[PDB]
Symmetry: C4
Subunit: 351 residues, 4 copies
Amino acid sequence: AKYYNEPCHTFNEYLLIPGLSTVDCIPSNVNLSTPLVKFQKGQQSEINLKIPLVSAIMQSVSGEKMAIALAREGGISFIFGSQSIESQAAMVHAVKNFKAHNELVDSQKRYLVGAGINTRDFRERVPALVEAGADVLCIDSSDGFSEWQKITIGWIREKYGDKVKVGAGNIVDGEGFRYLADAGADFIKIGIGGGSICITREQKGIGRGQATAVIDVVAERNKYFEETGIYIPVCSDGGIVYDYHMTLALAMGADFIMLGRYFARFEESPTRKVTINGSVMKEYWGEGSSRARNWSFEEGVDSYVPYAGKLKDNVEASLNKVKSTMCNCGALTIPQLQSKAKITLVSSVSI
Amino acid sequence: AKYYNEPCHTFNEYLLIPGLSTVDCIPSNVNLSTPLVKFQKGQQSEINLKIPLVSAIMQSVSGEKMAIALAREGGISFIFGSQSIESQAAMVHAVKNFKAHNELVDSQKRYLVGAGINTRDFRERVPALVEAGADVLCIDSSDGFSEWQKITIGWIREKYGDKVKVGAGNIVDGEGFRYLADAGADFIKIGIGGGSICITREQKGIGRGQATAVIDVVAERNKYFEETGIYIPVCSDGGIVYDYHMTLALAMGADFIMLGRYFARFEESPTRKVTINGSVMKEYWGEGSSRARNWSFEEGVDSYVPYAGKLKDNVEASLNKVKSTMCNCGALTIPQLQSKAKITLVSSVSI
Amino acid sequence: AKYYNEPCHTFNEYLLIPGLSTVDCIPSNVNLSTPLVKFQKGQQSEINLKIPLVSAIMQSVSGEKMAIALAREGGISFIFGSQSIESQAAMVHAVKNFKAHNELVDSQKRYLVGAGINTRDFRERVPALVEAGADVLCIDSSDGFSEWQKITIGWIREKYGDKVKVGAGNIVDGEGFRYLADAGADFIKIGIGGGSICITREQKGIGRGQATAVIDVVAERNKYFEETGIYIPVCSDGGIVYDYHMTLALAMGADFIMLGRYFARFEESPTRKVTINGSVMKEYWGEGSSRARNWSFEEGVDSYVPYAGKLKDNVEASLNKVKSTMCNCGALTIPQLQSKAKITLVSSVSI
Amino acid sequence: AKYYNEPCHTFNEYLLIPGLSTVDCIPSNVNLSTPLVKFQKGQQSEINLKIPLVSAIMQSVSGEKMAIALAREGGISFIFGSQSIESQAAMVHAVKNFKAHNELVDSQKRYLVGAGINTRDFRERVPALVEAGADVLCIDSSDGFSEWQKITIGWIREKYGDKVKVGAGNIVDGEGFRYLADAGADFIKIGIGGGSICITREQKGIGRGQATAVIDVVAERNKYFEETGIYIPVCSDGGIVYDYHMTLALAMGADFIMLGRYFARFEESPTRKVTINGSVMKEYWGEGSSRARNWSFEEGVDSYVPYAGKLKDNVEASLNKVKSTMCNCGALTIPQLQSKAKITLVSSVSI
Ligand SMILES: O=c1[nH]c(=O)c2[nH+]cn([C@@H]3O[C@H](COP(=O)(O)O)[C@@H](O)[C@H]3O)c2[nH]1
Ligand SMILES: O=c1[nH]c(=O)c2[nH+]cn([C@@H]3O[C@H](COP(=O)(O)O)[C@@H](O)[C@H]3O)c2[nH]1
Ligand SMILES: O=c1[nH]c(=O)c2[nH+]cn([C@@H]3O[C@H](COP(=O)(O)O)[C@@H](O)[C@H]3O)c2[nH]1
Ligand SMILES: O=c1[nH]c(=O)c2[nH+]cn([C@@H]3O[C@H](COP(=O)(O)O)[C@@H](O)[C@H]3O)c2[nH]1
Ligand SMILES: COc1c(C)c2c(c(O)c1C/C=C(\C)CCC(=O)O)C(=O)OC2
Ligand SMILES: COc1c(C)c2c(c(O)c1C/C=C(\C)CCC(=O)O)C(=O)OC2
Ligand SMILES: COc1c(C)c2c(c(O)c1C/C=C(\C)CCC(=O)O)C(=O)OC2
Ligand SMILES: COc1c(C)c2c(c(O)c1C/C=C(\C)CCC(=O)O)C(=O)OC2
Ligand SMILES: [K+]
Ligand SMILES: [K+]
Ligand SMILES: [K+]
Ligand SMILES: [K+]
């Protein structure tokens, strides 16, 4: 077997050490744009988010309303694919034709929207998604280091060339990243086990601390860029517990962040608002729970998250803190933060 | 005194990082066969389990019914030796003559069965066990790094040659493994302290994290194979808390796993089913407890484990998860898993 | 991004190993004097505290009474600047003209007093503070690694030369220290996150274990002294939970210590004494709390600390323990302690 | 300041890895003798304990009855010196003249007994102790790395030469050991902070994990023996929580062990037996508590320990476990254990 010199770590084990803050760095001047899909050196990505946040490919998170609400703030949602092909297409179509600011839109002023796909019914699902107007796709899986993802991406490239963007994952190391990059992925998703509704131990026992995973994949991605001139955006998916974890994920090299629990709390998530002993909550279940697969064990859990109100106010408060921290680190942009951030590990006792 | 460069670790401190999963790797195609006794290079073991699980040499675990139930699924039980020689022989005989699938049987279609022996009355116990039809024996001890085990194995070899298979242990490092290998053991059992009914601290203070023990013994075993051409199967005994710990133990090099608590929960264990406030439990006590030795201190404990029903359904669910994880690691067989597994240590905080 | 070879640590992770205690080292002979502002090699500081303790630049800690009570024992208070310029000046003036022992006074026998200032209204606030008689100033900020502090210090030097002393901070590493030193700071304050009313995680996620911060800044400060002949006193601000943490902070190189919670408990702090179910408490809130800024988030908290009585008796008990420990380390003075202290890290388990 | 490459550890962080157990190693054949005072190479110590246990120099532990009860089993007690010179002498005299097995006696068949002394009234106390018949003395202090201990030992050597044996301490590193060795100590006591009634943190903040302290002092002691031919026995004082900690302390190099709490639980300790809600307890307070010094702070605590009955049965049970573990390590004697023990550190998570 193969072992490692250091144990893996989660975002909670890190802190940012301030850098020189210049007079021109104020939150309002911080630019949170970031690339969504791959491009060659000297070019810009064909799709740039206004904010580095995307909602998870989950039944309890990314519905029609979530996609519109998030696109309006500059991010993008990946409509869950764990439903009928026609149901998913309808949601995508409803978002693209909603208008029939930092809004994320296409050349027709229509909100951008993503859609999750699987390695099984993609021959029928992809065409429907494209026809419906999906701006980008993403293969949704707990272990993307699979020949099935290579086959899926390959089929897409053979029928649509580079006109259809498709993200792949999830992986947690340089090898997995490399495999999906050579396969043609437009962006690679990082993370196995970090999620909130994730009980890694009581499951398969596969995974890696999110911080270690991002740091390792980012180094491979940068190495890959130097060898081929191809820059592949990476997404840190899961493991975000506090707002500052967002800044950490970006500082470590992630171009954008995928969140489930965070967005599930909003009015715009597709779940039921439930009042439990004076507290308003929202339903939240993992895609691995039996509650979701049904569309003696269980890959995820079914629980509740506290109601936080509308997405807008919460995302604004979260990103204001990110912007402020970025200025503490001497960064006016995400690339500058990734370049200048001073990140330290914290001792067990400190926690 | 002699010290080590690194502290020891338990299975809970590790996670598996996925490898390339090929299209041909599906749980149903995973082969869980594994060697039970030693063989020379170029040969196959004379006894191969269909599944890498064996039930512990304990009064509260391996009785007649357990041995039959486990053999039927492909594993083997070691009838406890902490009873009269005639009582143990009767159980062994009852298993071998029960018939008077992935079943583990001999050339006569009879279920395979093991039997534990001690370093004291082996001159009278072994013959009775052999005569009764025991397929394999195993010296049961908390510290197998003993001249007594060498003497016991030697006596067996002098009277039966290599016709009678005998496992030895337990040990936790390369030196202990080496001593038992040169002594002639057919398989060596790893583990001191890991057990569930083990309170190492409040005992002698001897032991080692199970993961570190297995990793160290496996390296010595591989070194031993290269020097002599003799492959000695090793057994990871104790310390298995979750199903994924099984995959970890195998990935680290253990050929098979010995479990006590896990099997004690089944209908087939020889203990009393007790209902405590709406919960059906099963009795479980260590071989070191006064409750067992009686056949001011105490080497083990006497407690309860939750009833899990029949062995079949539980073992199947456990091994399906192992098989699935193996495919995540790109392995269709145990040897392939031991060769390809990527194993990472996890930080204290992560736990 | 930039990473570090070791994780950061807090004061609770360290212990002092005794050195040779000579017959002449008794608590009563221990000298606790220490420099407040910078000086050149071969010289002495223009201001030396009699005891290495200063009260925090906070509304709930450093008022008129605190400043008088602390100066009387040999330390100094920094009147909080989070109030009107005229209100702060009045407090400073009241302290300087209170008389209209180990007392800390100027050549006119008047108690010494400090005053906090900010990087915004300093052009109007400084003159008022100087005119009122403030002996030393200090820029109060969560991240002193800022061009704004450079600008503020520069303005002071252009209008008052080296006649007005001004401390800067807070910083946590050699780079931050270096930036403020070159900027002209008379003393540099260390610490971000350590404070008691600090919830670093649920904030920006910036900071560093106080011990690691002090050790790193002290090494840079000593390096700076060797290169330029300028000795800049450093202050360990926050993170002091127990009396022995004081000895640790000094042993690690800090010239003096800034405390908030510690002093808030005294009769002389400007907050309300509140009786909660038989326990007399004192109010205490951070400068980052909304309760203080008002002069959807929050940089600090608003809580209670147990009443400890008058400052005198408590400070005396605290420093007697420091003096005693110093003798255990073979030190009669702070510089001798910084030179001879043997400091060991403690394992996680030990805690 | 001076730092260390590794953090310190306590006994709870270690486990013993078994060695080869030979047929001749059975508990009954294990020899637990050990040297009490220093000797030259090629010689034997003038005083050898039959068992490596000595009771602490405390008011709540070592009285007349304890000294007799322990000597009868082969150990020795150090009558507490925190009492009048005439009271301590009376106890010593009562023990030496009690008779007016593994018993520890002098050439006159009288029980051996020790007596604690301090660095202040030794000119009057020592003579009284010698005259009373004390077999060995020991300077009792929280920090023995003091010129006062050198002066005390020197005075004893000037008036009695090498006829009066005197132990010194406590120290926790090679430097402290070395200082007391050159000063003439007959044995050196290790340990600061480890004790049960020790709240190191809420005190001076001086100390070191007991295991690290013993390991470091033992290496210095062995180095000292090689340079001078003088073997100085060392005592691991405090930090013993479980029986196996005894085996660890010895394996690490300590010749004998000093215990307070352990012995306080016995019928023979000089404290009151108190029944608290069905549980019989014994009083136990540290020598640093105000309750003891009286013969605003506090170096120790005043609590209760569970009644364990007579010393005999408990010590026998404890040492049987030590002997058994020694055989697991292939040792028939303490020196053999110190030479052959395989000691591993355990991970934080394991605990
Ligand atoms: O262990 C898991 N069991 C599940 O059932 C599950 N469903 C989703 N996911 C993954 O978790 C991410 C969302 O995580 P958060 O709620 O932490 O933001 C998502 O983006 C996915 O990567 C799961 N992980
Ligand atoms: O500390 C111990 N005290 C005992 O009384 C005891 N009895 C058995 N064993 C050992 O534990 C293994 C079973 O462990 P699990 O229940 O964890 O599977 C078994 O296979 C044995 O190796 C003991 N260990
Ligand atoms: O996280 C924080 N939120 C706040 O609201 C706050 N107010 C003050 N400070 C800083 O804490 C120091 C006082 O700390 P102690 O109470 O621990 O002595 C002070 O000296 C400051 O450095 C804050 N830190
Ligand atoms: O922190 C302390 N405060 C006290 O008041 C105290 N009194 C004794 N000792 C020391 O502790 C040893 C006994 O420890 P145990 O009870 O752990 O065996 C003793 O042998 C001493 O080394 C003290 N340590
Ligand atoms: C697919 O959604 C996920 C993702 C992205 C992740 C995990 C996970 O459990 C699920 C749900 C698991 C499902 C629906 C079962 C199918 C499968 O195995 O892919 C995880 O642990 O890391 C990432
Ligand atoms: C023999 O069964 C075991 C085994 C295999 C192990 C342990 C143990 O305590 C017992 C019971 C201990 C008994 C019956 C006392 C005799 C003896 O000492 O052998 C353990 O700690 O690691 C492995
Ligand atoms: C200024 O007082 C502090 C100091 C010294 C520190 C911290 C802090 O939160 C505050 C309050 C934060 C305020 C008033 C908001 C303005 C700002 O950001 O400066 C901290 O974390 O380390 C040091
Ligand atoms: C003297 O008995 C001890 C010993 C041996 C130790 C400690 C201790 O606190 C006391 C009591 C402390 C007293 C009586 C105050 C006088 C002094 O300081 O010596 C400890 O921490 O390590 C070892
Ligand atoms: K900054
Ligand atoms: K895979
Ligand atoms: K000393
Ligand atoms: K052994």
